[PDB]
């Protein structure tokens, strides 16, 4: 890239998705890369895990202007990824989630726009696409506000679009490090619905979708990757399979309210959007989910999870 | 009632809605209803309009709460009305849309629960249940936090619930004022979808359901009145018919995005509520909607609208 | 003009004023007129009224400069007419008058400022000059902060200037639409003092002199409109005349404290003010009001009447 | 009295006004005397001029309602006189003046109303009559905000009221102590115009007037003290009398601009008012003013002189 | 306790402390321990882990006053523990740690009182004695906000005091889980100043503290735990010991800045305080530190390390 | 100068600082110096002692942005004075301290890198380096501010630095005029310890530092200026001796807290800077104080207080 030479802000950065980022880009041209947060643990652990003197790090929140435009002065590209994201914490404090979510984008792109921050890509959820939870709501009203600012700011002056991804593989919602834990512990796997499914998204695949809309999206545009599924039947299956493991699946039903699939489009933006190759793009204005897509064999899944380093690193160990 | 000698508020009252509270309520033994908006005009006109010593009118708005804690001081119940209610203005100003339904329904709650307000009703939409627009999106989100205050504050304290309810007949967003001029112009009358369904709620049907979650709501509670509906195409004929009008009826396909149906509740708060007699009640925690509910003869449809005030006068005036 | 491919900003613009200056403007070489204002309906009305691609509308309002910001960016020139200006309502709510018309015109200097606006007009009343209620002591105030603004900030980069008229005959304060009712409802017409006076200003006088100030104006000025004045009793008789009608006029007595004339510069203004030829000048630094102008005969006001859309509706329907 | 153990907060503490509660009230029965302000300078002054236990001294400003708090905290009465006074420092930051003398204002009522404050006496000024300049202006507002707010809150509560007093013989603004220093220089005295006007008020008279509304003033009243006037002439001639001196009075004519005279009441007010015996009080809803009063002859001005501390020593010393 | 019924916030609870005072507290009559915090995460593994109803988590932060008074509706005592603590973050952002420790304490404080909290105990560290950095500069100034909010606030209102303590024995900062590391690893051990020192002090101890001031402290009160010392050349002899390890101590002299000793208290404030027999009482208004204490042998060193559970584990675990 | 056509501006002009700045500087090429504070009343004292077109006077407070705002543009260089500077008042205030002396900075520093000021001289005190009180800790934190924020600005753009200075002689808290008075009074003087030091500085020597920094200065340095000592004693000497007085010395003995000795640079500052000649430099990242520096003879102290114009003039009048 392309990174170049150039500076790089992420908020929320101290995540797995803001690691991913810095492994895939500390070792490049690029001058800086800026991780924005309020906790100065995670952000020192950080510090003594690369010791990089391009990582630089700023306190502050997206709630506040203030501390942001401290960290967005000089900046080139915003990658967003701030943003209150469980579902019960969301449900229970909702208007801290409009705060971080919601007020805080808005803070994020006005402070990118007086900086004159080339690009912004503000990321979001599967969960934006029929919103019924808080966190989703929240996440849903975030794409309108960068949508809305998109509209009234010129391309060449500061570009504002955003992606979703749903679940990662073997990220904290994933069922991967439950399951590997049960195998290394001769317990049994529980699955609720074995054809419940989820797109197939590594850290990898995640990082390469916001360099993706970073290439590629126009103003306005949500960016979505595509990608295959699998029930969790068959990802069990597939575990179980690579550690040569014969742990008993106890399959136990629908927890009543769970989520049976992925939605990546709604009907309304899959019948807008572009077709770009291995992308679908909704420009600013039957569904695509993880039943309707390219089903992984239980053999595909396999090389799937192989391509994963925390799957190879408990596939030694064991 | 019930108001016997108490002081409601509305914001938003300069409406439809705080209007026909007002012709109910007015001769009553309340002791104030007191109409609390931005617009001085309006409350001038509703001043001129009642000549009532009842009727107190507040200049200030929602997302200003030194002003919302004037009106509040010694108020006992709140209809909570204040909103950005249409869709292209909540989809090109969303920010605007946050602060006013979403922070602006916070300030409310708070406001209210700080002069020991005895009761909130916030009133909601049907478009809350499945959000896909930007004005749904906030409204949705605007019930997550009454519902989250509702949870933290004994009911004995403040209660807070909320309604919903669609399509209000003959009022702005009704076809029937359109219907209604078409056949006075001698005009054809231009449908879409003839199919497409609301629920026939008139204005005094919303002001009983907020009075009746007034009256019998939980706290945390969204309360939804149960409906008839009838189809436009049968509405269309019932109106030509009571005009004894013959108005060629060009029916022209559907305009590619309407809203087809109207949804009270989701498959999923349906599945929770409490079926109260004429009323849902969805307790804080298929679908009900218009196609699938007691859907009425062109005859039966004749008879609620002439239980309509707007429908009357056309029809003597013509 | 003049205002070829430039962008005005209007607050307060769903207003009579706002409708004037877009009937005269919008099918000229302007390239957009923006409608800054809270009301969500109005705006809708306006945008179906004239279904032009050149008027914009925002949501926001002058005490959230955020909202402005978002209005400003880009334009040329901004006529600034948003404000509290009713007497019972300022006399209710100071504070609400003070946040609206001066805080309110602080943030709108300051956001025109900010985005290299090149004029701000401020309207004014003629009660600002003897300031005696609330809303006239704001509208003063509202002066005092233009005119400081204006000497901290050069002219090439924004000029900021105002402008005070009075009575608009036919508008929402006149007698006018009042008298014509009386005429077509067979009843009398109502005096109190017959000789109480009102300069004589059209809606295009209005728009007129803010056109002025706009081409004419150096900044710090106060600009008024040079304009006969009638007795209201001279008036009741030109109606009556014109509709060729024989209503009793009920003469009644002054109402004990009613505006006896109109006041547009004060002995201290005047004695400052440059004579331009139509228009006075007050330069940033006896009385001229409705009784000492050419008050006109009731022949003259009839010539008057007769160029008002109002009156001429009026007349034909008649 | 009668302030027997209670607490007095006075905002704007540090001037003459408060120096003067001081004097009069710190020997007696009262609990405490707050003195309110940003000044360190002249509250350590002030401290160290009286070393008395019951002056407490807190420092902030009637903008930060955070600092008011902490000083209204327990406070019985409050008399609120801070305020940005002078002509041309208000002319030139009238914003300034709007957040001190207005905004300011507001937040004092709210402190002391949240605070249980039983009574808030607001210092005015004659110039708020005929509020003719942005101090004027500012200061006519601040009476509208007490005014409006007296309305809404009940008297047993807290009481809401002001006065209005003019110029302090001997004070900052008083021409008093230029003619004394001309006398001691052998300089002239110069005069502008000899019969230009003001009543007369020494500093006692003026703390007396706070302590009558304190005591009688009906919450919304706005309090004045009846006084005598005298000419400046005559004012000039009785200081050169007591002197025994013989210095050359030259009068120069007017300088355009200047105040003649002092109204403290406005026909529309003076018509309203209730005569009380030794004050005027306008209730909550031709002119009082220096020319039409009591004028003094140069013998009774000696008289008035006399009764004046600074007078006094000047005398002695001299 | 004590506890008995009441219900407990602690800010910052997220932490080492949070965690201890839960350990502790949990199981006892307590009615709730409120935890928070802006992180979901960790409100999310604490909650994984103690599974307990009496848990209850707030998401929100000191900095937010809002988010704040939710936390502390109906909240007996509070353990003021948020902040930002490492050296280098405030000093790269101290405005940052002036929003945290010192603004987010008034907050905390003015909060508590509202709510009528009877207790508040900010905690505070060595580092406020003889404030050289950033981090100590606030913490030293939040102590001067407490102590300050005391005075004017009376003790059977809101209790306000606060504690100091400085290393924690293996917490984060402890140099003890970087030598039994070293152990493990077969590495050498690298002191550099091998006589400097360091208070002992367990988790338990700290809680302990805290709890002592909860009992016995009077507003106003600053509280430190009278604590032996070691050298840590001593106490890296007493681990090697421990484990029965003969790896390589490498003394390489004193990096040159690093702190020599603890001190807990300055001459000043010793020379103020009250013995009161396990602690010393600072009241609001030659030094206490880890040299002049009573110092360790190695074998009294080993008995302390034993009594901590981190040191218990490791050893098993070898 | 250097000064030459350039605007400075100081906040905290109306001080004994400001005033110095002014005698130095009005009659240069200097095009403006503005003075921006709150009190009117000393700016209207300033205004008429030097009735220079040049200084400009501005209303504001450095806690209030806009009114930064508003004064910062177009200047060149900030002197920045503003503080509350008393030991009690930041004592008993300490979170006004805060708003003033650290959050006050921030927005000046903030207002002037957005205005492109060349310079900001951030004046602080002895007291900033051991920090005892409110008054110093809120100083230490206001160095940590600036010095942080000159890391992230380019120099080019705006440099940032400051200076530290201890006792004036003969200004507010200078022993001289006590001393004077005292003689002149015919009484004892009064000295607690004779061997107690301050450093001695004039007035002329503090504004030569500035100048200093201003012309010297990298960005992030605190500067700091040479100059002996003397005791109390050999002060008191000193001036007896002057006037030709014959005053008993009355010797109390060390008032139980008084400052010894003044320290403009710690162990750790002093090993940091670099020797410049008349000035010390701490570079952004045993001791300097008055005990070990040049002491003085009575009779080179009696030449030092020959150049202070206030004692040049008591000795005249005496
Ligand atoms: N003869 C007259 O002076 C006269 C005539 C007519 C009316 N009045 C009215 O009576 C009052 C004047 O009393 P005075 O003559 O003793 O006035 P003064 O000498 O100007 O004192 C007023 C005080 O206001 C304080 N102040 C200014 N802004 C403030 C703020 N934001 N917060 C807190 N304190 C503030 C100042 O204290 P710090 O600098 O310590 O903050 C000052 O000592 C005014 O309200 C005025 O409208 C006076
Ligand atoms: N040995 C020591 O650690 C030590 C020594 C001396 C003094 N102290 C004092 O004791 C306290 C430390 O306890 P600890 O060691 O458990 O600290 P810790 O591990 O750093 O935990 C402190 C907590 O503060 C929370 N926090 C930070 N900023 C916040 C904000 N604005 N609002 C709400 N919460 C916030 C964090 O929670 P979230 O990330 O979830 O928001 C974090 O878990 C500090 O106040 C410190 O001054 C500690």
Same mark, same amino acid.
């Given at each position: 890239?392309?990174? /170049?030479?150039?500076?790089?802000?992420?908020?929320?950065? %101290?995540?797995?998705?803001?690691?991913?980022?810095?492994?895939?880009?500390?070792?490049?041209?690029?001058?800086?890369?800026?991780?924005?947060?309020?906790?100065?643990?995670?952000? /020192?652990?950080? *510090? !003594? !895990?690369?010791?990089?003197?391009?990582?630089?790090?700023?306190?502050?929140?997206?709630?506040?202007?203030?501390?942001?435009?401290?960290?967005?002065?000089?900046?080139?590209?915003?990658?967003?990824?701030?943003?209150?994201?469980?579902?019960?914490?969301?449900?229970?404090?909702?208007?801290?989630?409009?705060?971080?979510?919601?007020?805080?984008?808005?803070?994020?792109?006005?402070?990118?726009?007086?900086?004159?921050?080339?690009?912004?890509?503000?990321?979001?959820?599967?969960?934006?696409?029929?919103?019924?939870?808080?966190?989703?709501?929240?996440?849903?009203?975030?794409?309108?506000?960068?949508?809305?600012?998109? *509209?009234?700011?010129?391309?060449?002056?500061?570009?504002?679009?955003?992606?979703?991804?749903?679940?990662?593989?073997?990220?904290?919602?994933?069922?991967?490090?439950?399951?590997?834990?049960?195998?290394?512990?001769?317990?049994?796997?529980?699955?609720?619905?074995?054809?419940?499914?989820?797109?197939?998204?590594?850290?990898?695949?995640?990082?390469?979708?916001?360099?993706?809309?970073? !290439?590629?999206?126009? %103003?306005? /545009?949500?960016?979505?990757?595509?990608?295959?599924?699998?029930?969790?039947?068959?990802?069990?299956?597939?575990?179980?399979?690579?550690?040569?493991?014969?742990?008993?699946?106890?399959?136990?039903?629908?927890?009543?309210?769970?989520?049976?699939?992925?939605?990546?489009?709604?009907?309304?933006?899959?019948?807008?959007?572009?077709?770009?190759?291995?992308?679908?793009?909704?420009?600013?204005?039957?569904?695509?989910?993880?039943?309707?897509?390219?089903?992984?064999?239980?053999?595909?899944? !396999?090389?799937?999870?192989?391509?994963?380093?925390?799957?190879?690193?408990?596939?030694?160990?064991?």
């Amino acid at each position: 890239m392309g990174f /170049d030479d150039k500076i790089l802000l992420i908020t929320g950065g %101290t995540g797995s998705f803001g690691n991913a980022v810095m492994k895939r880009f500390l070792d490049s041209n690029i001058k800086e890369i800026r991780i924005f947060s309020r906790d100065e643990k995670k952000q /020192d652990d950080i *510090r !003594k !895990k690369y010791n990089n003197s391009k990582l630089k790090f700023y306190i502050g929140d997206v709630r506040d202007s203030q501390s942001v435009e401290t960290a967005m002065r000089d900046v080139d590209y915003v990658f967003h990824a701030a943003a209150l994201k469980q579902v019960p914490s969301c449900e229970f404090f909702p208007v801290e989630a409009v705060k971080t979510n919601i007020i805080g984008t808005e803070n994020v792109l006005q402070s990118a726009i007086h900086q004159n921050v080339k690009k912004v890509i503000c990321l979001s959820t599967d969960e934006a696409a029929y919103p019924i939870n808080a966190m989703g709501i929240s996440k849903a009203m975030m794409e309108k506000v960068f949508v809305a600012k998109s *509209r009234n700011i010129r391309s060449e002056q500061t570009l504002i679009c955003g992606t979703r991804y749903g679940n990662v593989m073997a990220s904290r919602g994933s069922v991967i490090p439950l399951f590997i834990d049960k195998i290394k512990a001769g317990e049994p796997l529980t699955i609720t619905d074995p054809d419940m499914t989820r797109f197939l998204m590594s850290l990898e695949d995640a990082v390469e979708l916001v360099v993706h809309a970073f !290439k590629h999206a126009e %103003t306005g /545009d949500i960016m979505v990757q595509k990608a295959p599924s699998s029930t969790v039947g068959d990802l069990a299956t597939a575990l179980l399979e690579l550690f040569e493991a014969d742990n008993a699946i106890e399959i136990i039903g629908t927890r009543h309210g769970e989520k049976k699939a992925e939605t990546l489009l709604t009907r309304e933006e899959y019948a807008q959007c572009e077709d770009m190759g291995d992308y679908f793009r909704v420009p600013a204005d039957y569904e695509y989910n993880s039943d309707n897509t390219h089903i992984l064999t239980v053999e595909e899944i !396999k090389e799937k999870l192989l391509t994963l380093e925390y799957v190879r690193n408990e596939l030694n160990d064991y």
